[PDB]
Amino acid sequence: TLVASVLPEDLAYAELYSDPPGLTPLPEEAPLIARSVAKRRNEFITVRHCARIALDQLGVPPAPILKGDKGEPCWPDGMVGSLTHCAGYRGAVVGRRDAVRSVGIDAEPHDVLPNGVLDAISLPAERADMPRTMPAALHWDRILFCAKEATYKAWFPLTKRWLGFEDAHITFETDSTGWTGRFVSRILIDGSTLSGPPLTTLRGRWSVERGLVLTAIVLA
Numbered sequence: 001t002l003v004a005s006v007l008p009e010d011l012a013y014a015e016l017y018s019d020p021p022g023l024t025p026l027p028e029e030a031p032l033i034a035r036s037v038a039k040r041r042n043e044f045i046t047v048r049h050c051a052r053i054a055l056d057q058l059g060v061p062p063a064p065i066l067k068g069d070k071g072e073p074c075w076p077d078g079m080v081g082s083l084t085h086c087a088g089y090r091g092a093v094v095g096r097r098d099a100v101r102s103v104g105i106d107a108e109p110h111d112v113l114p115n116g117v118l119d120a121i122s123l124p125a126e127r128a129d130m131p132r133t134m135p136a137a138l139h140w141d142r143i144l145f146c147a148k149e150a151t152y153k154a155w156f157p158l159t160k161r162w163l164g165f166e167d168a169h170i171t172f173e174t175d176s177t178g179w180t181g182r183f184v185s186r187i188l189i190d191g192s193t194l195s196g197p198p199l200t201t202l203r204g205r206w207s208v209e210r211g212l213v214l215t216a217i218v219l220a
């Protein structure tokens, strides 16, 4: 699997590269996408079908995955997880809370960012430092965006505070293979959590594979 490249008996994952036809949401999930468009409908369903494959293999029976604070996914009790999707990928990674404090993942196509995006999602330092050490064959701007989204998704559940794109400083290192590596996200705002020790440094992994950028953060 692709997501295995960016992950370190309490963690499961599942991914699919297309929308399997005929899949249907759970009954009390249905009103969430009654008015949604077809393309949104498919990835809503496919990613929750991936989520329940992983959740079942952690002895958790299928349960509805609703959306809460700023659309945040909701999980069965004692559970945490993360959902992601893009043009050719649907994936979920889930974990039990005591072993996994939080999960954050993202998947993106390995293409240049649309015009004007690199500036909103990034700091003057990240833009000077990343081109010095990232391999020439990589879209460091897109990989930066993927790492940014994977950080807020792992950050937000533990603080329920909004993490702007310029409240996190991400530094990258490239593994000797050249297409994979890992990063450190440093929080520039208060790291007060609702529970647990403060959180200011998040370590995650990044990978480029099959034309796709994958990132994941697992906070033990």
Ligand SMILES: Cc1nc(=O)c2cc(CN(C)c3ccc(C(=O)N[C@@H](CCC(=O)O)C(=O)O)s3)ccc2[nH]1
Pocket: 043, 044, 047, 067, 069, 070, 071, 072, 073, 082, 083, 084, 085, 152, 153, 156, 157, 161, 162, 163, 164, 165
């Ligand atoms: C810049 C920024 N900072 C934040 O802290 C932030 C927080 C949220 C709230 N949050 C934590 C989430 C909202 C949506 C999620 C998610 O995992 N979406 C999946 C599945 C969506 C679905 O099918 O319902 C996805 O992107 O596919 S996670 C959303 C955008 C943010 N953006």
